[PDB]
Structures are given as structure tokens and as C-alpha cells.
Amino acid sequence: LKFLQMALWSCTRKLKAASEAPEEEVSLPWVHLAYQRFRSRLQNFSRILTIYPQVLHSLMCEMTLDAFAAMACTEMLTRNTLKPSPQAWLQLVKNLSMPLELICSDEHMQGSGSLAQAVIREVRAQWSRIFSTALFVEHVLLGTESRVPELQGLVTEHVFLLDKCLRENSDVKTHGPFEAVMRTLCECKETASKTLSRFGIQPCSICLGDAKDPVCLPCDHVHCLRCLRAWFASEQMICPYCLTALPDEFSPAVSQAHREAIEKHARFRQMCNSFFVDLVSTICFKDNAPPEKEVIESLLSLLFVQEHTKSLSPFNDVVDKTPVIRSVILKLLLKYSFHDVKDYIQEYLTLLKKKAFITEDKTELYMLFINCLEDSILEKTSAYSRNDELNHLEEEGRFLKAYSPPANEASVEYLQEVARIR
Amino acid sequence: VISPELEHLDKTLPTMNNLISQDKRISSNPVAKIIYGDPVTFLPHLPRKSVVHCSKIWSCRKRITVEYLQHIVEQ
Amino acid sequence: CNEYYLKVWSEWERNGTPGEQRNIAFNRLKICLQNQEAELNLSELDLKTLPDLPPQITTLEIRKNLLTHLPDLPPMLKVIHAQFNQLESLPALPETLEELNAGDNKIKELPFLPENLTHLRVHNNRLHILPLLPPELKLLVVSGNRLDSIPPFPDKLEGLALANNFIEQLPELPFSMNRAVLMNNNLTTLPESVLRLAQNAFVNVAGNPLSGHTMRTLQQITTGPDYSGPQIFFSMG
Ligand SMILES: [Zn+2]
Ligand SMILES: [Zn+2]
């Protein structure tokens, strides 16, 4: 109640300071005006104190208690990382996300002073770090507990490594932090592979994927049953990878150990991919501004191996046999204004369309882009009000009036026009 | 009894549409040719140069709603 | 000098970290001293680095350890099986080395090799640069590395394997070659000498982005069984 008094008192003082007149006297009406003007901020501060009452102990003409409460929470979450228990910590982070994300938005805190702005800048870097570590925890750690409990220690260590690498500059929309996260996740997957088997995990030299139907040999390198049958036809007794003379009487079979190990490594890869995808979607592609050129270029590079296509993942260990095309990165880029993303999307199209992944009769490929562009517009329009809808319909009318029309191909501007017309 | 049938709509409907469109009562109608067939065959004014001037890029599409999500989730 | 050997083996024993069964190494190494053994073993001891090795042995097993770099070497260390260590690169190699296996390591490049090194295996390494090969290299194995390059093949390369690298172009296989494996490389084409070989050599070239018309070229050639060249395969399910 003391803190709420201080907050509403500062709001009243500020509002009266802007009264077009001095603060000769501060009457009761101004208090109601303050509540009306700062209702949401005060409710949010109350929500924060309710969720994590401990913040009060840390707290011991401008409204700033909310920003300092947020800073205290980010401190009393970076310090208590994974404590008391991973689930409680993750759940607290989740509960606080909504109020902390509100405080970190320019809309909620319009016009606050410079101390509040600097505090919010730090609270933003802190929240980015906390949220990234929390997503790593939720996807890799919790899953690892149930599926592959043997790795929980390594995942726990890498959590603090991630927190340590993101600390100084946590703007994952820039290049350095993005590469640092990708590098850390790659080291973690590599170490897990070395751990789950002292000879590691390698794909079969025939299929170069995971050794489905795993078959080991006196050389300890792994292959597949079906590939070994196809290889053993005749005159082909020796392994391909090492040229070892197999005993004439040899007969292959499956080792349960390796199939379990492979399944564990696949579950781990799946969790790490989910973490990367969530970090890109939520943290990287968040602002009202696209990430920098280097991040987008790296992401577009990750889709393809040196061509073959794969799902969005920093690991060059899974590949789609046929060149599949998917819409994720396109939807993410289209979250922003087309004017900014045109060159990225046209580079993506020219890259796919470079006989790397498609051959001819591309009418289906263009439809993919058009559909996403259509979705993008619909996504934006659903935010509009009734008068915004009328002004939109008039603008679109004068656009249809202004529209006027190379061959043998299409560009993202032509496809965006086709979508808008549709 | 009903549920077995709905599973096969994606095929059964194009079949019915074909049988209907090719019926004499329809197969000579231009609106039907536009809806079910490719109009380029019978409209010479239609361009045929740019990939954008195909038939499918200018075809309808499913509007996404909450009901359609509900149905997909249940399936 | 035996006392200095005893000192260095017991002191490197003093480096006993977790998992490193260097005590067992001490029984074996002292035994090697006592017999002046021709054969010695240190494999599977999870070791990470080694002290000076006995000089009079002609064989040394160090496989499945965690070694990353090696100490002084015998004069007559003919046969090393160093499969699956963490080696990055190896010291000066001995003269009479007639077989060496360094597969599953992390090596990037090796030095000069003997005249009679009839067998070499570095599968699953990270090699990037290959020096010249001997006249009697009955076997060359480089798969698992990151090579799109290869020096010419020696006169005596009977067995060859090259798969899982990035090879785009291959020198010619001599008449002595009898079993070539070139799977999932980045080869552009397989040259004509590969046909002139005997009618019994297996050549797998599947997984490569080979020239489709070059494929059809081999198609016309293979539909003519009148030639007694080897059997060439380009893909299997
Ligand atoms: Zn296979
Ligand atoms: Zn083998």
C-alpha cells in the first residue's frame, strides 16, 4: 500500500505538473485522473507483486516503481535460475512474461522519463536472456528428463553456458549472439553424441542417415541391415568403409543397443530443433523491425545443404530425400512490411528457383508464395477497425485505379500484386 | 455409419464434380467450363505467356476459420 | 637406460586421472621391458596422452583411448593400430612402418610416409591435404574426410576406397586396381580407365552427382557386354 501510494502520488504530481499551470494546490480530482491515465501500469505492478511477493524486499514526479519491480524480478530470476525446481522456475517466468512484456513495450510506457527508459532497456536485455534460457529449459531439459534422463546433467551445464554467452549482449536479432547460441547448441549435441556412446554415433556410409536397422561389425562402424543385404550380393564380402575381410560364414543382425542410442539421439535432435525454431520465432522475429541482414542470410543458408533441402535446423545431419519446400521463414519475414523484406524473399525465391530444388512448371511454387502473402495481408487486416476498414477499402480502390502492367518468370512484386488483386 | 464416408471426401467430391461437369446439360455451358475445367481451351482472349496467367493461380481456395480448425483438430 | 624407462612410466602413472587405468599399463609396460616384447598393448585404457614408448617393439596398440598427440616413437614401429583416439596430427613417422591405421581420429593432415607402407587407413578423420603416396601402397583409405581433392594413384594401389568425401574428379586407376568404392562422393564423372580394368572388379559410384549424359554413356557401353570390363553400379535401393 505504501508503494501504490508512492506510485499514484508520482502520477498525480506529474499530471498536475502538466496542468498548464503550477502545482499551487493539488486537489482530489487529480487522483482520479491519475488512476484513469495509469490504471494499467498500476494493475500490472500489483500483478507482479502478487506473483513474486519477494520483490517487495528488493524494492527497499514520475512513475517508476513498475520498471524497478521488473528489474528486481529479472535479478531474482537470473539468480534463482533453475531453483527451487526447473518446473517452478519456468512457470514463474511464464507467469511474469505477460506483465514483463507489457512493461517492455513502448505502448504501455509511453512518455515515461529517461530513468525509466534506461531501466526498461536493461530489463529488455535481461528478459531476452531469461526467455531464451527458459525456452532451452522447456524444450531440451524437461524433455530430456523423461526420454533420456542420462543427459540431464549435460543439459543443465549447458543452460548456464547459454546464460553466460548471452549475458553481455543478448540481442539475438544481431549476428554475434545468434552465432553464439547456434554454436552452443551444436557443441551440446556433439557432446551428447560422444556421451551416449564412447565410439560416438555415425550414419551408415550407404544411406548417410541414421543407421536404421543398426548393424555393427568387428570394426565397430555402423550400417543398416537392408543396405548390408544389398551389399553382400557376392564378391562384396568386406565392409565398404574399411575393407575388412568379413569371415566367410558371417551373418548380420541388429544390435538393440545401437537402435536405442540412435532413438535417444533423434529425440535430442528433435528437442534442440524445437528450441532453435522457438527462439527464431519468438525472440528473433519479434520487434516492429526485421533482424539484421546477417541473421536472415544465415537462416536462409541453413535451409539448404551444399543442393539438398532440410527443415529449419542448424544441424547438417538430416536431409529431405526430395527437395521439399516449406513456408516457415517466409511467414516470419512476412510478419513485417513487404517493402523491407522484398529483397530477402526474392533472394529466397531465386535460390530455390536456381535448379537447386525445382525444375519447371513452377506454378505450384508461386502459389506457395502467393498464399503466404495473402495470409500476411489478412493477418494485418484483422487488426483494423471499422473506419480503418473503410479507409482501406478506399485506398484499395484508388490502387486498383492506379494499377497498370518480365515474361518467362515472375518476381515477388508480381506475386504480391496477384495476391492483393485476389 | 456416417463417419466412414466423410473420410473419403477429398476424392469422392472431385469424382462427382467430374461426372456432373461432363454431363451434356453442363459440359457445353461456359460458366461450368470456368468453374470445373480450364477456360483457356475455349476463351482465346485469355493470355498464356506468363506463369501468372495459368488456371490455378486464379482458382479459389479454402477460407480458414475457427470451425475448420475445430474440425481438423477433431480429425 | 632401463631405469629411466622405469622412472618415466611410474611418473606418468603419477598422472592418474579418473578412468585412466595406468596401473594396468604399468604391469604391461614393465612386462614389455622384461621380455623386450615384439608386441605391446595399451588400448581401451581411456588414456589421454602417453610417455616415451619402448623402442624394441614392432607393434603398438593404442586404440579406443582419448589420446590427442603422441610422444617419441620406436625406430621399428611397423604396425600401429591407433583407431579411435582424439588425434589432431601425428609426430615424425618411422621408416619401416608397413601398416598404419588412424581411422576414427580427428586428424587433418599427415606427414611423409614410408616406401613399403602397404596399408593405410584414416577413415572417419578430418583430412584436408594429401602428400604423395608410396610406390607399394597396396591400400589407400581416405573416406570420412572432407576432401574434394586427391593426388595421383600409385602403381600398386590394388584396394582403394574413397566414399563419403567430396571428390569431384578422380585420377585413373591402374591395371592393378581390383576393388574401388566411390560412393556418395561429389564426383562429376568416372574416367575411361575404370572400364579397361578386368571383368571382376567391383566399382560402386552411387550417391554421386554424376553427369546424366555421362551416365547414359556408360549405359551404351554396358549394353555392349562384348567388353570384358568390370561391373559398374550407380545406384541401389
Ligand atoms: Zn543405409
Ligand atoms: Zn568394415
Residue numbers in the entry:
A (entry chain A): 3784 to 3843, 3854 to 4099, 4112 to 4210, 4217 to 4233
B (entry chain A): 4684 to 4758
C (entry chain B): 37 to 273
Sentences from the paper on this structure:
Among all 12 IpaH effectors, only the virulence plasmid-encoded IpaH1.4/2.5 proteins bound human RNF213. Cross-reactivity of IpaH1.4/2.5 toward RNF213 is not unexpected as they are closely related proteins with identical LRRs, the canonical substrate-binding site in IpaH proteins. Unsurprisingly, given the sequence identity of their LRR domains, IpaH1.4/2.5 engage the RING domain of RNF213 in exactly the same way. The cryo-EM maps show that the LRR domains of IpaH1.4/2.5 interact with the RING domain of RNF213, whereas the unstructured N termini and the catalytic NEL domains of IpaH1.4/2.5 remain unresolved. Binding is mediated by the canonical concave substrate-binding side of the LRR, involving an extensive interaction interface spanning from strand β2 to β7. Several hydrophobic interactions (for example, IpaH1.4/2.5 F120 with RNF213 F3992 and IpaH1.4/2.5 V177 with RNF213 L4036) and hydrogen-bonded amino acid pairs (for example, IpaH1.4/2.5 K100 with RNF213 D4013, IpaH1.4/2.5 R215 with RNF213 Q4029 and IpaH1.4/2.5 R157 with RNF213 C4035 carbonyl O) stabilize the interface. We found that in the presence of recombinant ubiquitin and E1 and E2 enzymes, RNF213 is ubiquitylated by IpaH1.4/2.5 but not by their catalytically inactive variants (IpaH1.4/2.5-C368A) or IpaH9.8. We conclude that IpaH1.4 but not IpaH2.5 is required for RNF213 degradation by S. flexneri. To obtain further insight into the differential contribution of IpaH1.4 and IpaH2.5 to RNF213 degradation, we analyzed RNA extracted from cells infected with WT S. flexneri and confirmed that transcripts for both ipaH1.4 and ipaH2.5 were present, indicating that both genes are expressed and that likely a downstream mechanism (for example, lack of IpaH2.5 protein secretion) limits the ability of IpaH2.5 to target RNF213.
